[model samples]
Target: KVFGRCELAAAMKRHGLDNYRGYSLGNWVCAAKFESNFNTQATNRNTDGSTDYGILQINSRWWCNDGRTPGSRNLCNIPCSALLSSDITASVNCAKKIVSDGNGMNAWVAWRNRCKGTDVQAWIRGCRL
Candidate 1:
């Protein structure tokens, strides 16, 4: 399902991601916007033939098994489809692990290219959260 920006922010906060991995909530919110536009069902095929899944766009090449991607690390130990759900606990947990593993938000290209060192406060503007 596609969530509103405020709804996504609340969910991220509820998942304890406001200060995850030493990154601000704004960064996470900005990353999610560029990565998937808050669409839980969002998916994108990369140039390397792997696919990015869900709100944070976890990559199939390293994070989850999408069945078609070969040599998937499946580091999250869950199907890629699991990220494409309204309940995002699993995806959030996996994202936490990814961040803990040193990738931080840098694991997301969108974060690097668009959110990093940017004024991310706009992501949560008027959310009142």
Candidate 2:
């Protein structure tokens, strides 16, 4: 499902994204906007033959195993299918894992280019987080 901004905020907050790893919910919100347009079904295949799956665009190259990417670590140890559902739990958890591994939101180039050090407050402003 393509989430409305506030709707996505609620879903993400429910899954413990608020202030995760010194990052605000707004940062997470902004990442999703650029990463997947708040669509849980979003997918992108990279030029390197790896695919990024679902809302956070968890990549098959280093995260989920899609059984197609070469030498995939499946670092999150999850099936790519789990991330594509409207349920944000799996995707949220994987994002946490990424941060907990010491990679900040900058792991996503979009976040680095667009969200980092910028005021992402608009993403969650009036969203009732």
Candidate 3:
């Protein structure tokens, strides 16, 4: 696991993601919780045959390329394996691009289903960032 809630908040803040690109830290944290429970190595194969990669659970269909998934857009221009690192620089950068590309937090289904319109302050509670 890469982080507890507090540590994640701190990291995001340090990386300038706390409120970067018009999205909140709370939004990012809550999505991360539901997507991967903060596990950097997390991956899930969806019923649609797409795979989600890393802490953000970025989809192979659009964000990253894996050989198993043909026609992947690989918009982030980085291998999916890069997202699995304990260092979240690549993943965070990619996530920012995803949001900036007009998807916003809507790019993450977990954000829509769980983090959206919910009280997510708890995700950063007690974090002294």
Candidate 4:
């Protein structure tokens, strides 16, 4: 599981703390829920339960294929190698790009509203490493 202790710690310190400019760790956690049920190794399936890959539910066929690779596919690549990169900023920024194309922070606001007024720290508390 990529959400192991050390990985979670690094995620908290890098992207989960300040987040991608004050979106709150809660928003990230919640987005992960909306994305992949917080399962770092999870992957969604098609109608036939095939062509699945990665924690963020990325489609390896489209994103991790020969053309896109990791960079072109952004965070929708197999294994979420973007997130595992030494440059955490690249990972978060890529996820943001995939989600909102420069307005992903708005997704955080929408997530907060959808979460029924949950506080930021409260969400963070549940997301312990």
- Highest TM-score against the true fold, candidate: 2
* Each model's Cα RMSD: 1.1, 0.9, 1.1, 6.1
The residue pairs found clashing in candidate 2 are none
State which candidate, 2 or 4, has the greater lDDT.
2
Counting clashing residue pairs in each candidate, in order, gives 0, 0, 0, 0
Give stretches of model 1 more than 4 Å off. none
Model 3 vs truth, CA RMSD: 1.1
Candidate 1 clashing pairs?
none
> What is the C-alpha lDDT profile of model 3 across 1-129, one tens digit per residue?
668888887887788788877777888999999999999999999887889999999998888888788766899998899999999898899998998987689889989999999988778887898
Q: All candidates' lDDT scores? A: 0.90, 0.90, 0.88, 0.47
Scored by Cα lDDT, where does model 3 land? 0.88
Q: Model 2: how far is 27 from its true place, Å?
A: 0.2
Error of 3 at 5 (Å): 0.9
* C-alpha lDDT (0 to 100) for residue 23 of candidate 2: 88
- In the range 57-116, model 1's lDDT, one tens digit per residue, is 998998899998887699999999999999989889889988888767888889999999
By the TM-score metric, which is better: model 2 or model 4? 2
Give, for candidate 3, the lowest lDDT window spanning 10 residues: 15-24
Compute the lDDT for candidate 4: 0.47
What residue pairs clash in candidate 3, if any at all?
A: none
